[PDB]
């Protein structure tokens, strides 16, 4: 029970629960009676959620509750919030209480790698190893899910509400689990999100980047809220465990990542991960398992996106970095992710998901098939490439 | 994982998560600065839940909630609860708190009850033997909280909230085991007592109601004082070796039934009533200074479990056996919530403020801030005055 591995222990936990429901969650809604509307509306609760809690941690650790405290309640919380909303048989009783889940999970992710980077000895020792446990317990929620009630005599849970259930436990545990954590301290205007960082959109540059990069947060988010339902629609079996290709992918890749960027050049990189994601969509677009090479390329676009995750996301932050001032990186960080991870999630979360009922739901399924999946995957694959063309011409740097 | 131990895990919790805060929050409250009103307040706040319960069971149910899964919320709700307040560093931010766990928490003993007696097979059978895991349950918090943490190398929690997280932490757990339980299935607040309020026109029901109601009222200040008199008095590990009046009370069951037989419900009830006086006396006189105090101590634990056993079930036996079979229940809630309730409320306040005004010493002397002895003779001859106002005025057959 060494604190550096209590911290550990907890950056997995964490991470766990959001993986437990996030990924399997589409397969449980189409199933009980939601459509691709509500489902989209689903999943937008955590973007919704993602951008409203600045506020929240404002809120959260102004007052004197040092981070360890607070957790623990706000993991009670997630615990029975999302139990309530797991037993829900409507849209309409189910989606206030995501929401209300949402709400307290996510200034939960601050809390966690705050009481991460206070008590650890030295950050660029131990930060980074603590955080890829993130990532590490994601893919345990994961194979746990989609894998381990397999291994026990029991059939595929994605189609019902245990995931739910999972991720209400684990909340449990890591409430209890925040007792043994040592103690955290602390650390009033409310605009410090965007006015701090809008005022850098003048630089050109930075600007290209900004909106193509909200542009590409609408198709990415195809992704999260469809890969498995269609997976599994096409014939892949355990999907929701085999998906973890690409947090594997994101992890081994990354270490390849550097090498890349000496040699090729930010905006090279930054439209590579553009390119990838392109791919794989198209990868998306023409397997359905039946045969060994649609089953290939299924995993390939898996394992793409770690690869895709890779070359955007982290070289992106990296280049907010050093393209901004100091005091005020990290209201710029807060601002892109505001808008592009928040509200880009929300557009094409919603987007897609009205989108898919209104053009896509088929009438009665097909081949499995209860929606022309390769369409939208192809959709999102051509906007994708004509962003990034624009990218590539209308932003360059050195 | 079988319906038929299921059930016995869940009790078992259930009454686990009670024992662990309850018997030791003396100790803690008192050495952070509270003061013995405040305590009493505290302890007041598992009555006044008791009181409000059936109106929050009579709201459970009428919206078609299962058993199962409102008791898992509710476990949830107390973990977080228990947490808040146990992180509280002064009465006026803690009592809040308490009160709002213990009235998410005293629902949950219904709810365990109902899961329990609907799935079971033969419920005469199989019935009881779920009953008693709740107290072997509060048996092991006992244990738990004033043995385990020294064999860890640790010392004694009891003057720390840790009894308070180790609530959290079992909550939370049994909360989690409520996915596992089976399916148990589910508007007059006047109902509870106005049924039984007509059945006071008779004499000894009236006698009795009211001689309880007295006698609850010292009988509180065993758990509330006892612990923090136990330890004061040097007596160590005392938050487990008061579990022997548990333990007591379970063996001794066995020799209830031919007790009760043999002279009726009038000797056997005051003798419920004499067990209880005599161990106060015990307690007035016990130490561990010398081995015979001591042995003083021990015995006092065993007869609070025998004094218990007469008086709680031979009592509840009377008025079955004394009420009207529809009524009967609502007899039951009644003297259960005036007398086993307001009794207590009173009791717990009573004594905490008593002993505030009239107990505590300026400066401790011997270990003892307070008149222990002092309070224990109070009660025990309150209980002796009751007992023959009970003696004369009660008539049997
Ligand atoms: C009151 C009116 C006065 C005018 C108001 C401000 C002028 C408008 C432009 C401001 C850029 C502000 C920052 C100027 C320097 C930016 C450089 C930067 O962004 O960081 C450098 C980084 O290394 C990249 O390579
Ligand atoms: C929300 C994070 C929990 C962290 C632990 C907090 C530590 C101090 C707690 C409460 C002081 C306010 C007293 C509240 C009075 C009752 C509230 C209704
Ligand atoms: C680090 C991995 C920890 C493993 C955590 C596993 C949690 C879910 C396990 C089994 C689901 C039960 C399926 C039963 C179906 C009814
Ligand atoms: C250590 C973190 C990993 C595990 C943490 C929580 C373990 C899973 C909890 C509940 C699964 C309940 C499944 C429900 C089965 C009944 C239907
Ligand atoms: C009935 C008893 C008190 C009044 C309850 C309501 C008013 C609270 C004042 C009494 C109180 O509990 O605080 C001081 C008391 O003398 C020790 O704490
Ligand atoms: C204690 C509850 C046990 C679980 C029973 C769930 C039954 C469905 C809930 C309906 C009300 C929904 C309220 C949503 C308000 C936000
Ligand atoms: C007998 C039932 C077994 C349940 C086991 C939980 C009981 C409490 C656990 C640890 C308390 C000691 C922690 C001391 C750390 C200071
Ligand atoms: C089920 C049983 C769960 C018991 C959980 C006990 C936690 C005590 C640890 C206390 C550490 C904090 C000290 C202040
Ligand atoms: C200012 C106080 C006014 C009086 C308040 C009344 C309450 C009782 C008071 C004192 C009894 C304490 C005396 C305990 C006897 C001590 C004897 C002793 O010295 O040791 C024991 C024995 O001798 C070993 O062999």
Same mark, same amino acid.
């Given at each position: 029970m060494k604190t550096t591995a209590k911290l550990s222990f907890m950056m997995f936990v964490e991470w766990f629960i959001w993986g437990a429901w996030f990924v399997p969650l589409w397969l449980w809604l189409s199933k009980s009676g939601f459509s691709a509307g509500e489902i989209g509306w689903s999943y937008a609760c955590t973007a919704i959620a993602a951008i409203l809690s600045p506020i929240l941690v404002g809120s959260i650790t102004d007052r004197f509750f040092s981070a360890q405290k607070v957790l623990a309640v706000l993991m009670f919380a997630g615990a029975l919030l999302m139990y309530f909303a797991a037993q829900q048989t409507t849209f309409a009783g189910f989606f206030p209480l995501l929401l209300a889940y949402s709400l307290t999970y996510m200034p939960t992710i601050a809390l966690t790698n705050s009481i991460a980077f206070a008590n650890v000895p030295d950050v660029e020792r131990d930060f980074p190893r603590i955080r890829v446990m993130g990532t590490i317990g994601w893919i345990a929620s994961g194979l746990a899910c989609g894998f381990l009630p397999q291994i026990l %005599?029991? $059939? /595929?849970?994605?189609?019902?509400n245990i995931p739910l259930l999972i991720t209400a436990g684990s909340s449990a545990l890591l409430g209890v689990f925040a007792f043994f954590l040592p103690d955290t301290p602390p650390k009033d205007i409310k605009?410090?999100? %965007?006015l701090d960082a809008l005022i850098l959109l003048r630089d050109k540059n930075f600007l290209v980047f900004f909106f193509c990069s909200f542009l590409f947060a609408m198709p990415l988010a195809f992704y999260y809220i469809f890969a498995n339902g269609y997976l599994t629609e096409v014939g892949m079996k355990n999907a929701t465990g085999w998906m973890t290709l690409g947090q594997f992918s994101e992890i081994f890749f990354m270490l390849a990542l550097p090498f890349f960027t000496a040699r090729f050049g930010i905006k090279k990189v930054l439209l590579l991960g553009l390119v990838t994601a392109a791919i794989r969509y198209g990868f998306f677009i023409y %397997?359905? $398992? /039946?045969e060994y090479f649609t089953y290939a390329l299924l995993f390939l676009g898996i394992l793409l996106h770690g690869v895709s995750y890779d070359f955007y996301y982290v070289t992106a932050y990296i280049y907010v970095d050093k393209k901004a001032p100091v005091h005020m990186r990290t209201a710029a960080q807060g601002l892109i992710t505001l808008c592009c991870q928040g509200f880009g999630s929300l557009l094409g979360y919603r987007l897609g998901g009205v989108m898919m009922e209104k053009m896509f739901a088929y009438q009665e399924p097909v081949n499995g098939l209860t929606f022309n999946w390769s369409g939208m995957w192809t959709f999102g694959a051509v906007m994708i490439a004509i962003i990034a063309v624009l990218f590539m011409i209308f932003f360059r740097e050195s």
């Open positions: %005599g029991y $059939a /595929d849970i994605s189609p019902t605009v410090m999100l %965007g %397997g359905s $398992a /039946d």
